[PDB]
A paper describes a structure:
In a double-blinded, placebo-controlled phase 1 human clinical trial, the recombinant, germline-targeting envelope glycoprotein ([name]) trimer BG505 SOSIP.v4.1-[name].1, adjuvanted with AS01B, induced bnAb precursors of the [name]-class at a high frequency in the majority of vaccine recipients. These bnAb precursors, that target the CD4 receptor binding site, had undergone somatic hypermutation characteristic of the [name]-class. The GT strategy for inducing [name]-class bnAb precursors is rooted in the hypothesis that these antibodies target the CD4bs with a similar angle of approach to [name] and use the same conserved contact residues. To verify that [name]-class mAbs elicited by [name].1 do not just exhibit similar sequence features to [name]-class bnAbs but also target the CD4bs in a similar manner and with the same atomic contacts, we selected five mAbs for further structural characterization.
One priming immunogen designed to bind to [name]-class B cell precursors is the [name]-[name]–60mer, which consists of a modified and multimerized gp120 fragment. Moreover, [name]-class bnAbs have very distinct and targetable genetic and structural characteristics. Specifically, they have restricted immunoglobulin heavy chain variable region alleles (IGHV1–2*02 or *04) and a short five amino acid light chain complementarity determining region 3 (CDRL3). First, [name]-class bnAbs typically have a tyrosine at position 95 (Y95CDRL3) and a glutamic acid at position 96 (E96), which are important contact residues with the conserved [name] loop D (N279Env/N280Env). Finally, [name].1-induced [name]-class mAbs are structurally extremely similar to [name]-class bnAbs.
Residue numbers in the entry:
A (entry chain H): 1 to 52, 52A, 53 to 82, 82A, 82B, 82C, 83 to 100, 100A, ...
B (entry chain L): 3 to 9, 11 to 25, 31 to 91, 96 to 210
C (entry chain C): 1 to 29, 33 to 169
């Protein structure tokens, strides 16, 4: 039974390096090229390069040349992929994948389970801005880590509130938008979002007015 | 350099046919949280254990995968490939509820954010099924890729899907263009919202 | 800008509600008609059949709304011993502070009473519609009272019913 077992998930800051390991068993380790493929969250697959485990020769994708190093250790039949100078847009699942045989080097027949590498910025409390209207809301911008709590009118307003899941931005920071649906009624009812980010002891109230 | 439709869907027992436009082509299936798996190689050949309801062909510059007799476990992302090149991918949904068109709300930057010398456009998308949308931002009819961050879709409490997309701009960029648009496409149907300074 | 009702004990903010209707008594015995929060009891409220899951007096909270405009009903309009059920079309938020008061938009409450008066006017003819405070009663009925979060709250409603519409 061919198995490719990868190292566990990794959490890094910008500028760090990561090295993912891929332990092979059940076949001739030096007999199959090993490829690396990554996939940013919600995005497609991207080939990074291959290593020939017999010679340790390599062929990196041009857009990673200078930043990636692929190596192996035949004594423990392990292949490695090191990516340096990480930015938050390098957040992705990284896979090792085996060439099937000598003649077919690209119909990857066995894959590792994947290694999630997430690259986050420093702890930071959110900035909060109004989303004026009907739909109105609050933009909860550039914070780390999860979670934040958003209430409206100190909890007096609960129905009609849709708080969207946060996006992890290329800055390594998160950003979500809590919005409320109203009839409009805007001139009378006052709307305030209450944002609490406990990891940074940030608490902010913001009035949302057209 | 291999282009695929962003999404495709069918009910159990129907089929989906996925094109791959640019040699040989192969196809991978990828379930959520799992590694991809080869299901077609050398245009039309099935690996051992892949049922014959998966088929493939190629004509000229275009290859296509068909999954026939759809089953729930066919819900997955599908990628074509040729040597190191992967296609852009197709999210396949096996329909489990009525389809629903996305509702789109687009907010311009706030005065307060502009005073902090920042600007963010917020495009909120909700109540759609299948849970796959393509979000494209435009600065005066021209595509803008820099500054875009888009979530994967997430289930709402009503079993439909939501997603959000953000465009980060400098105040100078916001104030210099005539308008910005968030365009969201759902199985080839496109709607667009537009905001403008002042 | 707000009609502020004093309440005991102090309802917390998460106990704020939408006022979706109310229940009135027409004073018995000058071309004017006087209405007060109901002198009835739970039986009157149940017969209205527009309440939600919230148990409350004088005002229906988180209940059913009418489609287009205010709807008023009675088992008998000529019988001052039977209450008048008022179903609103747009809710009126009552927001509690947690410090002892719950607040209603004065502007929206005046506009709501104006429409109620118009509906009452097309039922009793007449010209002048007057709202007055409760004639009296046990604490749960002379006050706008309601349950929330394991507690029962009593809010004096005097400021909600003192106005003349000609
Ligand atoms: C009425 O509904 C709101 C919103 O769901 C809720 O917070 C409040 O507790 C309800 N009111 C009562 C009295 O239960
Ligand atoms: C009243 O209903 C509106 C929708 O009409 C809802 O947004 C609001 O949260 C409700 N208010 C309370 C206090 O439950």
């Amino acid at each position: 039974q061919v198995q490719l077992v990868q190292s566990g998930a990794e959490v890094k800051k910008p500028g760090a390096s990561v090295k993912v390991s891929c332990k092979a068993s059940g076949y001739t380790f030096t007999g199959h090229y090993m490829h690396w493929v990554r996939q940013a969250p919600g995005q497609g697959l991207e080939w990074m390069g291959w290593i020939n485990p017999y010679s340790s020769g390599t062929n990196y994708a041009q857009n990673f040349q200078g930043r990636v190093t692929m190596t192996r250790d035949t004594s423990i039949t392990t292949a490695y992929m090191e990516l340096s100078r990480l930015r938050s847009d390098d957040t992705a699942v990284y896979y090792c994948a085996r060439a099937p045989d000598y003649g077919d080097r690209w119909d990857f027949d066995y894959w590792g389970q994947g290694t999630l590498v997430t690259v986050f910025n420093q702890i930071k409390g959110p900035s909060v801005f109004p989303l004026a209207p009907a739909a109105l809301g609050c933009l909860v911008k550039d914070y780390f880590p999860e979670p934040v709590t958003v209430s409206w009118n100190s909890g007096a307003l609960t129905s009609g509130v849709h708080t969207f899941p946060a996006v992890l931005q290329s800055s390594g920071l998160y950003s979500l938008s809590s919005v409320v649906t109203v009839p409009s009624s805007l001139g009378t009812q006052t709307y305030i979002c209450n944002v609490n980010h406990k990891p940074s002891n940030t608490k902010v109230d913001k009035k949302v007015e057209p | 350099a291999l282009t695929q439709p962003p999404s495709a869907s069918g009910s159990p027992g129907q089929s989906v046919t996925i094109s791959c436009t640019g040699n040989y082509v192969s196809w991978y299936q990828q379930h959520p949280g799992k590694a991809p798996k080869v299901i077609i190689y050398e245009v039309s050949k099935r690996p051992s254990g892949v049922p014959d309801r998966f088929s493939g062909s190629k004509s000229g510059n275009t290859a296509s995968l068909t999954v026939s007799g759809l089953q729930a476990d066919d819900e997955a992302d599908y990628y074509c490939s040729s040597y190191e090149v992967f296609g852009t991918g197709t999210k396949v949904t096996v329909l489990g509820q009525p389809k629903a068109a996305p509702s789109v709300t687009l907010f311009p930057p706030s005065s307060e954010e502009l005073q902090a010398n920042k600007a963010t456009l917020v495009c909120l998308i909700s109540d759609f099924y299948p849970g796959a949308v393509t979000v494209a931002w435009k600065a005066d009819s021209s595509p803008v890729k820099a500054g875009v961050e888009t979530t994967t879709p997430s289930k709402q409490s009503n079993n439909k899907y939501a997603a959000s997309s953000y465009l980060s701009l400098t105040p100078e960029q916001w104030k210099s263009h005539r308008s910005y648009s968030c365009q969201v496409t759902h199985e080839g149907s496109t709607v667009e919202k537009t905001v403008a300074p002042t | 800008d707000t009609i502020t009702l004093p309440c005991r004990p102090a309802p917390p903010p998460h106990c704020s509600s939408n006022i979706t209707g109310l229940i009135l008594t027409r004073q018995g015995g000058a071309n004017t008609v006087i209405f007060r929060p109901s002198g009835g009891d739970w039986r009157d409220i149940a017969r209205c059949q527009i309440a939600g899951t919230v148990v409350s007096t004088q005002l229906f909270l988180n209940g059913s709304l009418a489609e287009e405009e205010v709807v008023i009903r009675s088992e008998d309009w000529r019988d001052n011993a039977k209450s008048i059920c008022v179903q609103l079309a747009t809710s009126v938020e009552i927001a509690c502070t947690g410090a002892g008061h719950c607040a209603i938009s004065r502007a929206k409450w005046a506009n709501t009473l104006k429409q109620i008066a118009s509906k009452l006017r097309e039922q009793y003819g007449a010209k002048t519609i007057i709202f007055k405070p409760s004639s009296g009663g046990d604490p749960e009925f002379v006050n706008h009272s309601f349950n929330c979060g394991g507690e029962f709250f009593y809010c004096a409603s005097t400021q909600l019913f003192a106005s003349t519409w000609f």
